[PDB]
């Protein structure tokens, strides 16, 4: 148990407010759509699996993308190049050894040159002002997990899963802080596996009541419910693997009891 769980959590809550993408950004983009962002992120999940990257890199990459898209207009034909350079940057930040830049060229089918990927890396860094250490759903999940009684593998996996699904859909998820999404996803995963609930420990640490989580939860319960129908499926395929105790197969509950 840390001396600074508390200091870290506190500080992560300070930083997420600052590292927030604009809410309405996608409506101000002439040429791109929430549905393209979704195709883009879903693809990034596959890239993550294919190179065996950590889940945190994935989350980091989506943060970069959304902040980038919040100050720069992008054309359909460049979106994938933003994504690619984000995933590279994220890999550099978070992975022990990142894939070689060429791999990054390869995963697009040579549709951009290495030099284009390297200058978009530079452009991303400058727009983000080298501010890469963004708080994620994944980080807040990991803190929250310290408060389970007792630790439940399936719950951890299934909360991860729910957290990732939320990356896919700007849709609604853009208007929640990561600390809130991770709250909702921890509850929903808890509830789903045991019937248990968002614990007083965390109610006190986070100062989030279950009530306060209601709107996010409702949205996330919907997303969970329709997940097998969603146009994007990369995260479900990912979360079938036994690595994750197959949780994305388990049957979501059809009401939440709120």
């Amino acid at each position: 148990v840390p001396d600074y769980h508390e200091d870290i959590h506190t500080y992560l809550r300070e930083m997420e407010v600052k590292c927030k993408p604009k809410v309405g950004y996608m409506k101000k983009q002439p040429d791109i759509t929430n549905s393209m962002r979704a195709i883009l992120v879903d693809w990034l999940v596959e890239v993550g699996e294919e190179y065996k990257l950590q889940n945190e890199t994935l989350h980091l990459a989506v943060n970069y993308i959304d902040r980038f898209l919040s100050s720069m207009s992008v054309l359909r034909g460049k979106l994938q190049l933003v994504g690619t350079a984000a995933m590279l940057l994220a890999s550099k930040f978070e992975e022990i050894y990142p894939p070689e830049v060429a791999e990054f060229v390869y995963i697009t089918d040579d549709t951009y040159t290495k030099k284009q990927v390297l200058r978009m890396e530079h452009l991303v860094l400058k727009v983000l002002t080298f501010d890469l250490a963004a708080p994620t759903v994944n980080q807040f999940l990991t803190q929250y997990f310290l408060h389970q009684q007792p630790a439940n593998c399936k719950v951890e996996s299934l909360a991860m899963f729910l957290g990732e699904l939320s990356l896919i859909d700007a849709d609604p998820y853009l208007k929640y802080l990561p600390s809130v999404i991770a709250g909702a996803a921890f509850h929903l995963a808890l509830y789903t596996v045991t019937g248990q609930s968002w614990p007083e420990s965390l109610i006190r640490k986070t100062g989030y009541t279950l009530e306060s989580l209601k709107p996010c939860l409702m949205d996330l319960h919907q997303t969970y419910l329709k997940a097998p129908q969603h146009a994007q499926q990369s995260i479900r395929e990912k979360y079938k693997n036994s690595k994750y105790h197959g949780v994305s197969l388990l049957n979501p509950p059809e009401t939440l009891n709120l």
């Binding site: 393209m36 195709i39 693809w43 359909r76 979106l79 994938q80 995963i107 697009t108 549709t111």
Partner: peptide, 5 residues
């Protein structure tokens, strides 16, 4: 893949 938008 190229992403066809």
């Amino acid at each position: 893949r190229r992403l066809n938008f």
